[PDB]
């Protein structure tokens, strides 16, 4: 078949390009950004994904700059990058499924994702967030379609850093990032001074969705979304509104009082799952758990049990190889995060 | 069959309570706002819609206050309102179809609505907007699901004033109103000083959608939406952004957007509605006067089913107030013939 050879620059290390050959190209994803292809490396026979985007030569691609610095087991790895035509081509790890597709399979089969997988996937997402956040980097587009999954190993990898940005105190950021159902209230209210905790709200929406079988805060307009949020969290206090967006414009919302979180999910739902959701989906941004505190939550204790296994009989992926960087926001959590048996 | 009798206040006359009895109730629409039912009046056997929403005792319902003052052939009429349980119930005209349902029928059959209907529906939507805007009222949620249609008469009625508000110069307004695909760029950018022209952008999105067979500016995030907009309008100039980090793609020949044989006037109207600079967009009245609607002003025009078109020229002074001289185009010669 058609073999393409290019001279590409390695994602990490010194800037020393090498000839790379690949074949068996085919589309696997789209979006406004550009196209994602699957390809096979002639050398190793390995499958990789190539994300191709139009690049204005007069400026540095921000996604590329962020990817060159990331190195984590729960984030898709940038293997190489090269230019063609002008297009920037990001050669990344290929993962065969997404949380989006898997949840949809269960959904239209009238089944819910077994909790052991909800635990595994969410724990790995929080690890990836603790890592990028320790560098001040906010993903800003956490949603099921951006959570890659390997069906057999149960490994999850965060992808698509096209909206990612280092958030700096006092510097304004656009409020129009983040996909519909996963946007934190402060973004809906138009704040430009938000923090990385908007990713935590997004992660809480994904957890709730996996437990429920459908999005927890749907709506075609910001108003409709806020109504679904109010039905569950109750009406925001004047103080809470202040904390979300210092410059709120003022709207009249029907004063509704908190709907018992336990009344939200089906009866069999683990109580720890519900408590974690309530600590993630909070109006006050600073009141939400940090990613690391989420990883340490009791909902994930089963993952720390010495004898846990995947339903397919294999062992769980690596869950405890935390680095100092990863733990930097709160070192003492290591006593919970790294169980007695792990190494 | 269960019959409900309530004592209700008339939509607009003097406050003379009336006894209203209805039956055969069923949900025809839902939403975060409140449920809309269809019901049958016992006496005349006529169908009506009942929109029921929770009513706080802190404020009087804004949709209710706005609808008590509206009277127009292209806006659904508030007949009565009454409270129950506390719920506010608005009794309104019933229309059997929506642009949303009609467009979906054609779309999933790989066809587009015949252009004569695009003309009729869009013209009537622009008339309804010229009317509410002449009172400074902005709908703020123009979308296919809020455009009611009568299949046989081709009459269109604007509905759902749950987001509507009188916009006053210098007063801030929330930027989180309006549905996803139909939001003006300035709302996506978070402006709180927008004008009624956000309804015009929304109307342009509906026209483009009816011509195309699918939404013209889809996207799950504001960023994705802006990229689809830029692909068509080109990159906003610094000045345009002011009036309201993306790749500098240029101006896309709107002609490349629609299928071959799409009327050139349809394309020109779309380009004058979907403009970055809000003040640069046509006003509703100017849109009605656009050449894309000339066929509706032809003395011999008929609906495909053979019936005559609905009333299109009975403009009032209020309706024309934003630009009286347009009447020389809006009211065709044959519509001025003496009785
Ligand atoms: O394996 C992958 N590596 C990536 C790196 C960056 C962006 C996407 C991907 C990607 C993807 N893998 C998929 C498997 C099934 C359906 C969609 C995708 C996808 N993308 O839609
Ligand atoms: O006939 C109507 N009068 C209304 C007044 C206010 C709000 C809605 C309506 C309304 C509606 N008519 C419909 C016909 C088919 C599907 C949905 C609707 C609907 N609404 O979804």
From Swiss-Prot, chain A:
Expressed in testis, thymus, prostate and ovary and weakly expressed in lung, brain and kidney. Colocalizes with EIF2AK2/PKR and TAU in the Alzheimer disease (AD) brain. Changing residue 88 to A: Abolishes activity toward AXIN1. It is an enzyme of class 2 (transferase). Activated by phosphorylation at Tyr-176. Inhibited by lithium. One of its GO terms (molecular function) is scaffold protein binding. It comes from the Eukaryota. GO terms for cellular component: axon; beta-catenin destruction complex; centrosome; cytoplasm; cytosol; dendrite; glutamatergic synapse; mitochondrion. Phosphorylated by AKT1 and ILK1. Upon insulin-mediated signaling, the activated PKB/AKT1 protein kinase phosphorylates and deactivates GSK3B, resulting in the dephosphorylation and activation of GYS1. Activated by phosphorylation at Tyr-176. Phosphorylated in a circadian manner in the hippocampus. Mono-ADP-ribosylation by PARP10 negatively regulates kinase activity. Coiled coil: none annotated. Residues 22-300 form the Protein kinase domain. Keywords: ADP-ribosylation, Alzheimer disease, ATP-binding, Biological rhythms, Carbohydrate metabolism, Cell membrane, Cytoplasm, Developmental protein, Diabetes mellitus, Differentiation, Glycogen metabolism, Kinase, Lipoprotein, Membrane, Neurogenesis, Nucleotide-binding, Nucleus, Palmitate, Phosphoprotein, Serine/threonine-protein kinase, Signal transduction inhibitor, Transferase, Wnt signaling pathway. The modification Phosphotyrosine is found at residue 176. Its EC number is 2.7.11.26, 2.7.11.1. Monomer. Interacts with ARRB2, DISC1 and ZBED3. Interacts with CABYR, MMP2, MUC1, NIN and PRUNE1. Interacts with AXIN1; the interaction mediates hyperphosphorylation of CTNNB1 leading to its ubiquitination and destruction. Interacts with and phosphorylates SNAI1. Interacts with DNM1L (via a C-terminal domain). Found in a complex composed of MACF1, APC, AXIN1, CTNNB1 and GSK3B. Interacts with SGK3. Interacts with DAB2IP (via C2 domain); the interaction stimulates GSK3B kinase activation. Interacts (via C2 domain) with PPP2CA. Interacts with the CLOCK-BMAL1 heterodimer. Constitutively active protein kinase that acts as a negative regulator in the hormonal control of glucose homeostasis, Wnt signaling and regulation of transcription factors and microtubules, by phosphorylating and inactivating glycogen synthase (GYS1 or GYS2), EIF2B, CTNNB1/beta-catenin, APC, AXIN1, DPYSL2/CRMP2, JUN, NFATC1/NFATC, MAPT/TAU and MACF1. Requires primed phosphorylation of the majority of its substrates. In skeletal muscle, contributes to insulin regulation of glycogen synthesis by phosphorylating and inhibiting GYS1 activity and hence glycogen synthesis. Higher expression and activity of GSK3B are found in the skeletal muscle (vastus lateralis) of patients with type 2 diabetes. Several potent GSK3 (GSK3A and GSK3B) inhibitors have been identified and characterized in preclinical models for treatments of type 2 diabetes. This is Glycogen synthase kinase-3 beta. It comes from Homo sapiens. The chain holds residues 35 to 383 of 420 of the full protein.
């Amino acid at each position: 078949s058609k073999v393409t050879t290019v001279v590409a620059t390695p994602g990490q290390g010194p800037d020393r390009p090498q000839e790379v050959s690949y074949t068996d190209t085919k589309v696997i994803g789209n979006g406004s950004f550009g196209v994602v292809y699957q390809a096979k490396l002639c050398d190793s026979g390995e499958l990789v994904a190539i994300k191709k985007v139009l690049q204005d030569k007069r400026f540095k691609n921000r996604e590329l700059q962020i990817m060159r610095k990331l190195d984590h087991c729960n984030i898709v790895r940038l293997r190489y990058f090269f230019y063609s035509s002008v297009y920037l081509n990001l050669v990344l790890d290929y993962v065969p499924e997404t949380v989006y597709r898997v949840a949809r399979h269960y959904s239209r089969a009238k089944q819910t994702l077994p909790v052991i997988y909800v635990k595994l996937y969410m724990y790995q997402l929080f690890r990836s967030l603790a890592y990028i956040h320790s560098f001040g980097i906010c993903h800003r587009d956490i949603k099921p379609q951006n959570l890659l999954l390997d069906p057999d190993t149960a490994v999850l990898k965060l992808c698509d850093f096209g909206s990612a940005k280092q958030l700096v105190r006092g510097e304004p950021n656009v409020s129009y990032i983040c996909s519909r159902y996963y946007r934190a209230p402060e973004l809906i209210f138009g704040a430009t001074d938000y923090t990385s905790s908007i990713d935590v709200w997004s992660a809480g929406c994904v957890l709730a969705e996996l437990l429920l079988g459908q999005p927890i805060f749907p709506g075609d307009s910001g108003v409709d979304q806020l109504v679904e949020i109010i039905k569950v969290l109750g009406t925001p206090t004047r103080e809470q509104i202040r904390e979300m967006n210092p410059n709120y414009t003022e709207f009249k919302f029907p004063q509704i009082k908190a709907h018992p979180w336990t009344k939200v999910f089906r009866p069999r739902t683990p109580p720890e799952a519900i408590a974690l959701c309530s600590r993630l989906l909070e109006y006050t941004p600073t009141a939400r758990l940090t990613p690391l505190e989420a990883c340490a939550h009791s909902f994930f204790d089963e993952l720390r049990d010495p004898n846990v296994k995947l339903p397919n009989g294999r062992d769980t992926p690596a869950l405890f190889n935390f680095t100092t960087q990863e733990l930097s926001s709160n070192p003492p959590l290591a006593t919970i995060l790294i169980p007695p048996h792990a190494r």
